[PDB]
Structure formats: C-alpha cells, structure tokens
C-alpha cells in the first residue's frame, strides 16, 4: 500500500506571456519545465536519498525512468524502496511513495525550491491514499488526485503576495511589479527590472542549451532574434491540443486491459513518454517549413512548451498556417507509429492514430501576447467542437472521431481583441456568416470512413489552402488573377444583402473566370452555400488570409 | 525640438504641359480603360508623390546615384540620422483651360507580318491637352544657411522643361 | 525558527508609535494621507519632532503607516475615526507592554530588494541627515539618508520574505514580508 | 472654460493611418465608432503642438531649450519620456484638452444605415517604385492605399482650464502662442510630404489680432508661473452619519471612447470592462463639495460609489458567479445551455465541465424559467506613435509604437452613490434640485484629456434598498466586486479562513464549511491592482484580495443570521476601502441558491 503524489502546475498562461520581452517568455518557460523535471528530481534526491536527477542529467531524457531496475517496481516487496516515478512531464508530474511523511516533505521540498528558483511560479502538489491491495487503486487514485486539486488550488492561500509595489518602488521596465535590480534592454542600455523578469532572463540560457537536443536552428542569439521579431510584419501565437487524449488518461483502465497496477503503470506512464518523443519529432518535421529563413543562423520561432498534449509556439506570422498544418499532419502519422499508442488508440477510437487542434493568433509585434494567447484559447476550443460534428460509426456512448483540426484569426486593427467581437462582427446580416470555421485538417481518406465525413471536407483545410492559391496566381504580364480593387468591391458585397454579393458576384466572375473555382452553391452563381440553415463562405478567409501562407 | 528649421522656402509658380500629360489613377472619371488620376473632388490633379518622384528621379541622375545627398533632402526611413523629407510636394489641380476637356487619344498595334492591326491590341488612352496649368507646389525646409545648389539645379532644370511627368514619357506624353 | 507578531488595538497612531520607540529607535518610516506619502525619521529616541501635529488623522490625516529598523517593523492602519490596530514584527522575541503576542513558525528566509526612485540628485536637500533622489517620471524624491550620494548610485530598499508551511499537503507560500533598511547600490 | 472649437477644413485628399493594411489595402484610415473617417485627437495635439514649437524656436532664436519652450512645456504638458537625468521639477499637464474632430453631427446622421455611403467617402489611391536602371516599375513595391476625400471640415471640441490666478497678461500670451500654431499649421496625417492631408486649422475666438498682440509685445513677457496641485480643503461639517441609507442611481454613457488601466506592461496598458468607483471622486467633489465635507466623508466611510457594471434589465449588472459551469463542448452561458450551479449540482454523467470566469449576468430570481441575460462590453485596441521630433519619425529611442485597449463609445453603465440620510439631510435642506444637477459630462480614464474618456452622467430617481433573503440555515456569499482583506498582521493576503472569522464575526454567527464530496464549497480567484496616487505622483500599494464574482457558501452551524445586518453589509460593503468601490457582496442570492442545468436562455432611417 502507499499515496499517490501528484504536482502539477498552475496558471502556464500567464507565468509565460505577462511581459512581452522575447527573452522573458523564454526564460518562464523554462522555469515551468524544470520545476517539475530537474528541480523535481533534486527534490526527490534530498528526501529518499535518490540519484534520480543525476541519472537524468547523464541521461538528457526522461527515458531513463522507463527501466524499473532503476526506477524500482515498489508494488513488488523485492524490488523494495520507498519511492516510484509513476510520470513526469511539462507542467504536470506524478510520483508514488508508501509513507505519509515523507510524501509531505516531498511535497514542501519542490515547491520551497520554487519559491527561491522560480519566483513568481505557482505550483502545488496533494497526496492521496492508495489501498494497493486492490486492483485500479492506481487508476482511482489518479482521477481522485485531479479532482481534488482543482479545489485545493482555489482554496490555497494568495500566490501573488509577495511583490507587491508596497511601498513604493520604481516600475519595472516590462512588467507591473516594482524593480528590483538592473539589467539590460535588447540595446544594452541600462534599465530597471523586477527579479521575476530577471530570473527569467537568467534561466532562458538554460533553453537554447537544452534546445541543442532538439535542433541547432532554433536559437543560438536570443538578442538577435529579439531584435527580428520587432522587424516582422506579423507574429503568431500558435496552440495546440491533442484530441481525447485527456479523455484517454480519464479512461485508461478500460484500455489496459488487464486491470493489474502494474499493468496500468506500465501503459500509463509509457504512453505519456510516447507522445512526448512523438511532439518533439513532429516539431523536428515541421519547423522545414521556416524555408525562406533557412539562409540564415536561427529560424525565426520559439517553443515555449513542447511536450504533453501540448505544443505552444510563437513564429512568423505568414508562416504559421502551414508550419502548424505539418506539426499536425506529422503528429498524426508520428501517433500510429508507437504501439504504445496502437493498442490504446485503437481500443479507445478503431485507427491507429490520435489527434490534436490547434489555434493560431496573428498579431503584429506590439500586441500584447497576454491578449493573443487568451485568443487563440477561444480559437482553439471552436476548433475541439469536429469533437462533437464527427463521431464513431454507431458509436455507444457516442465518441468523437480522430481528427486534426485548425482555427485561427488575423488581429487586424479594427476587427477587435475577444474572439466573440471578432465573429460578431463577421455576422453583418443575422442569417449569414462571413466565416466558415473551424478547417478540418485530416485528410478525406483517414475519415472516410467517419460519420459527418461530408461534413468535414466542407470545412476541409485545403479548400481554403486551394482559394488562397488562386489568388495568387498571376496573368501573363505578372499581375494576379483577381485584381486588388475587384477584391475590395467583393469584400464590400459581403456586408450588403445576400442578394447583394450574389449579384457582384455574377458580374465579377463573369470577367475573372478565375473566380468559378470559388463558388460554394453548386450553381455557380453564389459564393455563399448554406448550412446549419445560416449563409456562410469561407471566400473572405481567402482575401485576408491570401498573404499568409509559406 | 521640432525640426529645427533656419530657413523655409516657399517655391511656386506655374506647370505648364508642353504635351499631353496622363497619370493614371485606379478607375478615374474616365470611361477609359488607361483611365487619368482624380483628387476626392473629381477634379484632374497631379498627385504630390508622382510629382516628387518625377523630381526626385532627375535629382539622382544629376547626383550620379550618390544616394547619401539624395537622402538627405528627400529623407531615408532606414538610416536611424535621416527620416523625413526636407522637400514637400503639395497636390496640385490641373486648370485645364477655357472651353476646353480631356481628350482621347486612340492607341493600336500593328502586325509586323500583316502590316494590320493586330488581334486585341488596341487601347484608347484618355490625355490632359496641351496647355493646361497647375501649381507648382514646393516647400523646403534649410536647416544650413542659403539654398542647396543641387536644389538649384532642379529648378533650372524645370525652367528648361527638361523633366517629363505622369504616363507615356516616351512615345508622346509627359 | 519564528516570526513574532504583536497586536494592540483601537490604539491612536501617535500612541502606538509612542508605545513602541524602545524599538522603533532611529527607523525610516513611511506616511500614507490622502494629500500625501512622505517619509519620516524618528529621532535615535524613536520620538518624532511633530508628532500629534504630523500623526494627527482628522485633517486629510495619517491613516496608514509604516516604520522599520534592523530589529522591527511596525505597521499601522485606521479602523475608525483615526483608531487603529498596530501590529510589529520582530524576528525576535521582544516583549511589548500591553500587546498580544503570538508567533509563526517559517521554514526559511530570503533577501529581497526594490528599487526606489530618482538618481542621485545634484544638490542634497538643505536638510542633513538626508538625501534627495530624482527621476522626471515623479520629480523630486526626498529619503532619509545620511551618507552621500555618488553620481551614478541607486538607492535599493532591502526586504526579508519568510517561506512557511500553509498547506496541510505541505506548499510552501510567503507568509510576511518584512523591511529592514535603505541600502545604497 | 469649455465651448471653445476647433474647426478643420482639408484641402487635399487625406489620410490617418491605421498603422497596418488589410487584405488587398496596404493603408487603411481610421474609422470612429460610426464607421466614418475622422481625425484622432492624440494626432490633433501632436500636430498642434509640432507647429507650436516651431514658433518657440523663432522666439528662442533656434535655442532648444529657453523660456518659449518654457511656454510651450506649459501649455502642452512636459514630456517627461524624453527628458532624463536629475530632474526635479513635477512633471507639468498641460492646460489645453482637444477632443478628436469628427465630422458634423448632421452629415455624420445622414449615413446612417447607409452602408455603400459610409464606403464611398474613401476611395483607393495607387503608388509605385521605380527601377533607376530600367525605368520600369519595380514589381512587389506596387503599393494601394485608401485616401479620404477631399472637402470634408471637421470640428473638434477644446477645453481650457488655465489657472485662476493667472495674470491677464499671460492669458493674451497663451492666446498669441495657440492662435499661432493655428496659423502655422498646413499638414497632418500620413504622406504630408508628399500631398496628403494638407488643410486650413481655426480655432473659434482666435484671429490675427491675437497673433497681433504677441508680436507687439513678445519681449516683454516672462517665463511661465510655477504650477501648483489643486489641494483639498477638509472642513469637518459633517453631521454624523445614521440610517436609512438613501442610494443614487448613476448611470454612465460612453460618449468617447474610455481607457481604465487594469494591468500596465511595459508600452501597452490592458483595460477593465467595468469603471472603478474610485474614478468618480473627483466628480463627487466638483459637484457636492460645496454641500459638505466630502473628503471628512470618505475618511469616516460615511460615502460609498460603487464601481460601474454595463447595465442589463434596466439594471446595473452582476459578475459572473464563479459557481456557474458549462459543459466543455456544448454548453455554458455563451451557448445559452447546459449551465450547472455547482453548489447544488452534482456533474452530468461523464461530461467534463469548465467553470464559467467572464462576462456578466442580469436578473435572476426563484423561479425564472431562464438562464440570466448575459452582459458584454465591446473593446477596441487603439494604437498610437511617437515621433522623435528631429528627424520626424519614431525611432526605438523615442519609445516608438505605444497602445491602450479601450471601452468603446455608446456602452452604457451603472453605478450607486450611496449616502446616510444625515448628509442627505444636509443636501436636500440645501439644494432640493441636488439630484438635477448632478447631470453633468466629465472626463475620466488613462489620457482623460485628449479623444479618450468623454462620459455622461445621469441620475436617476432614488433606488430601493436592497433586501436580503435571511435563511437560518445557509449563509452564502456573492462578491459582485472585488473584496479587500488584510491578513492578521495588516499586510495583505488572501486566506478564506479569514474571511471565514471575518463574516461570523460581523453577522454574530458561527459558520462551517459545506462538506459533501461532490457540492463544491469555494470558487475563489486571486486579484492584484496597479494604481496610482494623482494626488502625490506615486503608485498606490499593490492591493491583493479576491476578484468580483468569486463565490462561496456555507452551513450555519449556530446562531441566527439577522436581515437586517444582511442588509447593511450589502449597502456598506465589507473589508477595506469600501468606500472606493471594493468589497460589495450580496447574499443567499437566488441564483447562487437555484438549480440551473435543466434551464436555457431565452430567444433573443434616416434623415
């Protein structure tokens, strides 16, 4: 018998993106990770007297808790020690141990490190029991410990009260906290910041080291790069989730099949080790795309988290559609390729494969992240809905299919900062949509089998990916096949009447043959077709989108 | 401070087209296709920046491309020392003259085989008539005493009706 | 390992401040009022050259203050019509006559530090004993400081931050913070 | 002094810049909260001013630093971003406010409705580069950018507030100096240098006779007087403070757009979607300081305002209890379904919920057969430039692009102006018209004097005191604003236990937690304020506590909660700085105390 312990931590959105500097983002995200990575083991280490943070520093990789020679099967009495790594990860990680005061220590130990490495991070931990002589005791265990963390959190004593600006002290350069100490704008002039900001800044070196693991093209002057992403016409936030994928740890106990601990370990925790190689390799294929920039020292991105369900990145604007297009359509190939996802993946859905949603923001340099990472949030919760408008073939209960799906928006000034502003404002006439979201990802033939299949090539990806091609075809003399000031009369019919912009429609197309291709109808006479008994277009995705492609 | 100007030059006086002149606009009160420039008023006009590049062009062949004199008049938003231009060019209505409208001028090509008008290649190119007068609208700001001799130079030049403007500057125009 | 904290109450600011100038000997203390924020010296007999007439409430008056030195911090904030709960800290247990006292135990303890405003002005203020820092974003900035200025110093306030228990799971969370002195950087 | 105009007449096709393109437009201009072009007041000032400087620098004979840039410096504030080192003086704000100018109010109306018209004011402008080798144009810089017609005269709002003891001399002075600017003034917006935007500026009430006066008299005047802060002058009138507690509906309307800082970092500061009540104050002093002490009020609690919520049913409107989920896919309060009160709602079987953390809900009440009407304020995010005034562009070292989330305009608001009947005694007996005259239009916010923070507002007739449902059972508790608490040693912290001894102590009661597994008891969030001391030039301490539309309930385990002490604390306000607006808390509310999964939302010319 024993606890569980689990730590897990809190608030990763605003920790990363409260100040705008490059630099700090970097450094926040390393905190984040190596809280519950290195700083965990050395946790460990000075409580039972392990070596875990050694062998995973000669290691480089989580991997090595993968062999329960090292990482003792304490359920066996033979294999005897008071501790087991069940998983570690970004954010989140869980540890077993059979003796209640040393599971408070452990506890206490990481998040006293915390406080002194990481100022300005949450993170908490709980302990619960676990009666191991009953099978699923881990499993239970594992949903108890979520569900009473999430009150824990509330009920925990004031996180924030600690820098306060009380008494009165100097403003920190990018940041609401007072100053603390000096350090250094990309210029190198001499400026005031707060020991959030500058810890951060101290920890971001430890990123393009460890970075080194995944690619030498990502970061190698984060001052130089800083001093580009204020050149860039546009950046993005992109976000992305992995489909059911929660669901699945919500589950496991069906999918193990043999309802033994060790069973449930074994998978769990191999599994999770598995998507996280499956999103670094993904991320490796991807970050091709950045072709333009491949002249030149770093590639103009920046991961921030990278591992879990979780890929969170910002980039080059224009790039980021297609850059996140291939993240996915690699992930999902990646995914079918471990049978430590095959036999969980097609237990929980029939494929092989799983799947992920993602929202991207695009904004320009000034725009505050904080704002931008909240969007892409939104965007990609309407992107999760192929969740519900794509199911498993009589499935019971009713399950969502596989499927990768992308929503986005391009912030331009007017159009507001609150994703419910933002489609508010493309519903000009109450009946009619200017959007057509979210784009199915997934290629036709891996859903084809799938209820709402028809549905989804619809809002397929590549409909629009097409569209936005023909815009930028030319004419022989080099001019392109719709002229801008014909585009800015069809925008324009889109706010009038559907009568309206079916008629400009008519009058375009009938000079730009071009424009056929762009008909939704059927008829060849709209670029609305209807849906859900609302007009809706993905045209106009394609007049502001038509740049931002790679 | 504001910039610290010694000296502003008020430079004015009459344009007068010595051919035809078109600069083509986007659309234009013309039926034409080739379809002339229009300010917000409808009225035929030089655009400022037109007439500021037609100057600025003949400044760097005197110049001989030596773009750090010409930046330093006409302003550079790359170097960090420079920015705006110390030239202003004002937008200026055409007076075309009494009783008097735009013209159409006809446009065709000729098959060099057939010696005839060659399929699709026609086109009718709407012009101001000869004669017609606008404002020339400059403004210099001297932040050193006198006048730029270069600057000299430029005005010479538009005394000797040396510098075309707008469309067609060589099969007719300008 | 503790913090001890005091308490007394319906107290009137000048007869805390009175009650505690045994420890409050020599400290900065900082002035909140509706017209102002100033900053004060006590004397090395921790009294106040206008006392009544500076702690005085009614008149746009003090409502909420602090004191510190190396040993204490005193804080004090109105309650009503210019009463008010005085509460010390004291890394050390110093008895204060008529206070409740009681105590907190914490885990460790950790330096911190702020960055007050203005550089080293061009001229001290005509009072000695002082020092006069100044920045355009705010002006003038007048702190009780007895050694000089060089050009290009900064003046840092130095804080301590006590780490304890607050969780029964055991997380560790700031409990206090505690001032300790001006420290020219 | 108010009424003074601003009067613009554009003689060229012109152009604000939205800063960026979109689509196939490389430039697009700025456009009002009526969709028509319109000149932004920080453009109208810093134009302005750049023409003022010029006549500083032929008075200072090219000196950039002298006693005409004194003049200027006075008249349009000290920049202190740009100035550095030592400086002592307080940074000076300027004396001269300028709205934006904006079409005339008929014109404007006109288009109303007409969408095709409030196009066709703009139209689109081509640009090219030229190759220098082949005399071609060069492709990729083929450039489109919409330009606003020529023609058009706009008008702008200025206000003054010179300072009462300034000498008549000075007056003619200031006069002299804006009156020239005026004059000096041929260009704004985007392209000057090249033809865009030049124009004819007026003010009303200026004219060469005020230049006249300057130039036969500008040797002789002086430096600028010294500024002076406007004190406060405390008289302790006040007649002590008893029941009833009467309670002033005031209603705000956004007639410009408003900016209230909720988090400033670094050259973006982010906005609040409610109004602070602490921005009212100054209002309370311009209107009833006359009628008593009002700063002997505040210090005493005798005044609370409330913050202002957007106004839903007639009525101001209500944080969104933290208690509320929706179900992850399909539901919550933005879907208009699948909404579980989580205080008396077990989870649906297998649906994930998450809780509900924005926005704002109505009216609710016992048996409503609906979901609350839900509240939304629209923001923009304006942005605006330095230019480094030398080389006339904005530059890294000038700070470069800077911007504000703002409220819109025509958002509308509610607040409460809650006074003891002895002040209203001492009012009334006074002033039996008060409640008139509080109708005024005043300026509050970030920037307050340029095109932001332009607000109405209006009385209504005196609100009922609100009434609290006693149950002897259950004590729950709704913070419909943020809620302030010192921890035990006077610091700020956030523990619920406090607030725990807090509440029992005040209602004389003993409280438990509610213990069932699946009823959660707390939903809390942390908050944490940056402000600022105007009165002194320094931030406020950072205030700590909970933020509005935290909940939480609980057992009573003994005693019996009084409704009448129910209903003070609802009035007053509980913790720290009531007074300001924090602390405002409501009771056993309905909504919290209802069962809502089963529930939806209702079905929602010109001249």
């Given at each position: 018998q024993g606890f569980l312990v689990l730590i897990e931590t809190s608030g990763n959105q605003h920790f990363i993106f409260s100040t705008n500097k490059l630099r700090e983002n970097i450094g926040a995200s390393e905190l984040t990770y190596l809280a519950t990575t290195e700083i965990l083991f050395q946790g460990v280490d000075r409580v039972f007297q392990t070596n875990y943070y050694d062998q995973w520093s000669d290691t480089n990789s989580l991997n090595f808790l993968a062999d329960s020679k090292l990482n003792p099967a304490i359920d066996d009495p033979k294999n005897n020690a008071d501790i087991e790594i069940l998983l570690a990860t970004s954010g989140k990680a869980i540890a077993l141990v059979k003796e209640e005061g040393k599971a408070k220590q452990l506890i206490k130990e990481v998040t006293k490190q915390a406080l002194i490495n990481a100022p300005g991070l949450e993170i908490g931990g709980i302990y619960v029991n676990c009666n191991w002589q009953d099978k699923l005791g881990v499993a239970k265990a594992v949903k108890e410990a979520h569900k009473q963390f999430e009150v824990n959190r509330a009920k925990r004593a004031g996180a924030n009260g600690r820098f306060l600006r009380l008494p009165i002290a100097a403003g920190c350069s990018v940041s609401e906290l007072p100053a603390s100490d000096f350090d250094y704008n990309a210029d190198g002039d001499k400026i005031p910041v707060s020991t959030v900001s500058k810890v951060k800044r101290e920890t971001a070196k430890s990123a393009k080291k460890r970075l080194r693991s995944v690619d030498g093209r990502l970061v190698n002057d984060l001052a130089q790069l800083e001093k580009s992403f204020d050149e860039l016409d546009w950046l993005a936030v992109v976000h992305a989730d992995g489909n059911g994928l929660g669901q699945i740890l919500l589950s496991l106990e069906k999918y193990i099949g043999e309802q033994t601990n060790r069973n449930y370990i074994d998978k769990y925790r191999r599994l999770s080790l598995a998507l996280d190689n499956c999103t670094i390799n993904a991320f490796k294929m991807a970050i091709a795309v950045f072709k333009e920039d491949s002249k030149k020292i770093d590639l103009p991105i920046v991961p921030l988290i990278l591992g879990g369900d979780d890929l969170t990145v910002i980039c080059r604007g224009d790039y980021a559609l297609e850059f996140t297009r291939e993240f996915l359509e690699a992930f999902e190939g990646q995914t079918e390729t471990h049978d430590d996802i095959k036999v969980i993946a097609q237990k929980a859905f029939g494929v092989d494969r799983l799947s992920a949603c993602a929202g991207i923001s695009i904004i320009k340099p000034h725009f505050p992240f904080s704002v931008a990472y909240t969007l892409a949030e939104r965007l990609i919760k309407s992107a999760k809905e192929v969740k519900q408008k794509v199911t498993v073939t009589n499935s019971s209960p009713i399950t969502p299919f596989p499927c990768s799906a992308i929503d986005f928006h391009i912030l331009y000034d007017?159009?507001?900062?609150d994703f419910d502003r933002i489609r508010e404002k493309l519903r000009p006439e109450d009946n009619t949509e200017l959007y057509n979201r979210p784009y199915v990802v997934t290629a036709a033939e891996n859903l084809s089998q799938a209820q709402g299949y028809e549905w989804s090539q619809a809002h397929s990806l590549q409909t629009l990916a097409d569209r936005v091609s023909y815009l930028r075809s030319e004419d022989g003399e080099g001019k392109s096949a719709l002229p801008s000031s014909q585009s800015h009369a069809l925008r324009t019919a889109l706010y009038l009447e559907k009568n309206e912009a079916d008629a400009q429609y008519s009058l375009i197309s009938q000079r730009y043959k071009i424009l056929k291709n762009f008909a939704e109808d059927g008829e060849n006479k709209s670029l609305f077709h209807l849906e859900n008994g609302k007009y809706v277009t993905r045209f106009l995705d394609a007049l502001d989108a038509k740049d931002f492609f790679a | 401070m504001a910039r610290k100007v010694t000296t502003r030059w008020k430079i004015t006086g009459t344009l007068i087209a010595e051919t035809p002149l078109h600069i083509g606009g986007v659309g234009g009160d013309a039926d034409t296709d080739l379809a002339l420039a229009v300010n917000g008023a409808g009225e035929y006009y030089v655009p400022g920046t037109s007439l500021a590049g037609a100057l600025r062009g003949w400044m760097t062949q005197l110049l001989n491309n030596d773009e750090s004199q010409i930046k330093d008049l006409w302003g550079d938003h790359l170097d960090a020392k420079r920015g705006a231009s110390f030239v202003i060019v004002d937008d200026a209505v055409i007076?075309?003259?009494?009783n008097a409208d735009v013209e159409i001028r006809e446009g065709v090509g000729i098959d060099r085989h057939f010696g005839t008008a060659a399929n699709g290649f026609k086109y009718s190119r709407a012009v101001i008539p000869k004669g017609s007068k606008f404002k020339l609208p400059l403004t210099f700001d001297s932040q050193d005493d006198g006048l730029p001799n270069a600057l000299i130079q430029l005005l010479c030049a538009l005394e000797a009706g040396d510098i075309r403007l707008g469309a067609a500057k060589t099969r007719g125009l300008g | 390992k503790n913090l001890y904290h005091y308490h007394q109450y319906e107290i009137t600011l000048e007869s805390a401040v009175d009650s505690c100038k045994n420890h409050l000997q020599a400290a900065i203390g900082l002035l909140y009022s509706p017209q102002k924020c100033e900053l004060v010296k006590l004397d090395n007999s921790g009294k106040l050259v206008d006392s009544y007439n500076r702690l005085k409430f009614n008149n746009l008056g003090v409502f909420e203050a602090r004191f510190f030195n190396l040993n204490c911090e005193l804080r004090w904030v109105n309650e009503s019509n210019g009463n008010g709960t005085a509460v010390l800290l004291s890394e050390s247990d110093i008895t204060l006559t008529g206070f409740e006292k009681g105590l907190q135990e914490f885990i460790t303890a950790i330096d911190q530090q702020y960055l007050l405003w203005g550089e080293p002005a061009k001229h001290p203020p005509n009072a000695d004993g002082w020092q006069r820092l100044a920045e355009a974003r705010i002006g003038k900035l007048d702190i009780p400081l007895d050694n000089p200025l060089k050009p290009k110093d900064r003046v840092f306030l130095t804080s301590e931050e006590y780490i304890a228990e607050v969780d029964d799971f055991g997380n560790c969370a700031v409990i206090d913070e505690r001032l300790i002195k001006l420290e020219v950087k | 002094m108010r009424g003074i105009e601003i009067t613009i007449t554009m003689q060229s096709d012109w152009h604000v810049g939205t800063g960026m393109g979109r689509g196939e437009l490389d430039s697009v201009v700025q456009r009002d909260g009526d969709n028509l072009p319109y000149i932004p007041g920080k453009t109208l000032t810093g134009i302005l001013r750049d023409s003022c400087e010029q006549v500083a620098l032929g008075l200072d004979n090219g000196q950039t630093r002298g006693l005409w840039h004194g003049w200027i410096n006075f008249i349009f504030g000290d920049q202190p971003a740009l100035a550095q080192g030592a400086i002592e003086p307080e940074p000076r704000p300027a004396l001269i406010a300028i709205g934006s100018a904006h079409l005339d109010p008929k014109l404007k109306a006109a288009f109303q409705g007409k969408k095709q018209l409030q196009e066709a004011i703009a139209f689109m402008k081509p640009g090219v580069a030229i190759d220098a080798i082949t005399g071609t144009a060069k492709k990729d810089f083929l450039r489109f950018e919409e330009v606003v017609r020529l023609g058009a005269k706009l008008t702008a709002e200025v206000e003054l507030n010179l300072p009462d003891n300034l000498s008549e001399t000075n007056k003619k002075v200031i006069a002299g100096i804006l009156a020239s600017g005026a004059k000096l003034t041929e260009r704004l917006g985007g392209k000057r240098r090249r033809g865009n935007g030049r124009c004819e500026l007026k003010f009303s009430g200026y004219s060469d006779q005020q230049i006249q006066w300057l130039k036969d008299n500008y040797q002789s005047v002086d430096q600028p007087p010294k500024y002076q802060q406007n004190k406060l002058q405390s008289a302790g009138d006040n007649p002590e403070q008893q029941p009833p507690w009467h309670i002033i509906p005031l209603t705000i309307k956004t007639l410009s757009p408003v900016v209230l800082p909720a988090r400033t970092v670094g050259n973006v500061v982010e906005c609040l979607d409610y109004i602070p009540g602490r921005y009212l104050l100054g209002y309370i002093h311009k209107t009833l300081g006359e009628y008593f002490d009002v700063s002997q009020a505040i210090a005493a609690g005798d005044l609370i305002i409330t913050n202002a919520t957007i106004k839903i049913d007639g009525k101001a409107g209500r944080a969104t209890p933290f208690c509320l989920f929706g179900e992850k896919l399909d539901g919550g309060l933005g879907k208009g379904k699948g909404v579980y009160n989580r205080f008396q709602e077990s989870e649906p079987d297998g649906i994930q919920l998450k809780g509900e953390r924005g926005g704002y809900v109505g009216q609710f009440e016992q048996e409503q057969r609906n979901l609350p009407n839900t509240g939304k304020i629209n923001s923009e995010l304006f942005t605006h430039n330095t230019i480094q005034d030398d080389v006339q562009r904005p530059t890294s070292d000038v700070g470069g692009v800077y911007s504000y989330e703002a409220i819109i305009a025509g958002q509308t608001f509610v607040a409460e102006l809650r006074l003891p009947d002895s002040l209203v005694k001492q009012i009334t007996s006074k002033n039996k018209n008060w409640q008139a005259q509080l109708k005024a239009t005043i300026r509050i916010g970030?920037?307050?004097?340029?095109?932001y923070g332009k607000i109405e507002v209006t009385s209504g007739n005196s609100a009922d005191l609100p009434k609290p449902t006693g149950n002897n059972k259950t004590l729950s508790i709704w913070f419909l604003s943020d809620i302030l608490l010192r921890g035990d040693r006077l610091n700020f912290n956030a523990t619920p236990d406090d607030l725990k001894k807090y509440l029992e102590n005040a209602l004389d009661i003993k409280l438990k937690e509610r213990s069932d597994n699946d009823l959660i008891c707390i939903a809390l969030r942390s908050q944490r304020t940056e402000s600022w001391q105007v009165r002194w030039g320094l931030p406020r301490p950072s205030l700590v506590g909970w933020q509005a539309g935290s909940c939480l309930i609980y057992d009573i385990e003994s005693g019996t909660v009084n409704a009448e002490k129910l209903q003070e604390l609802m009035i007053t306000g509980i913790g720290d700085r009531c007074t300001e607006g924090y602390g405002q808390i409501g009771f056993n509310d309905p909504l919290l105390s209802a069962s809502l999964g089963k529930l939806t939302a209702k079905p929602k010319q010109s001249n």
């Open positions: 007017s159009s507001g900062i | 007076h075309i003259p009494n | - | 970030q920037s307050k004097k340029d095109q």
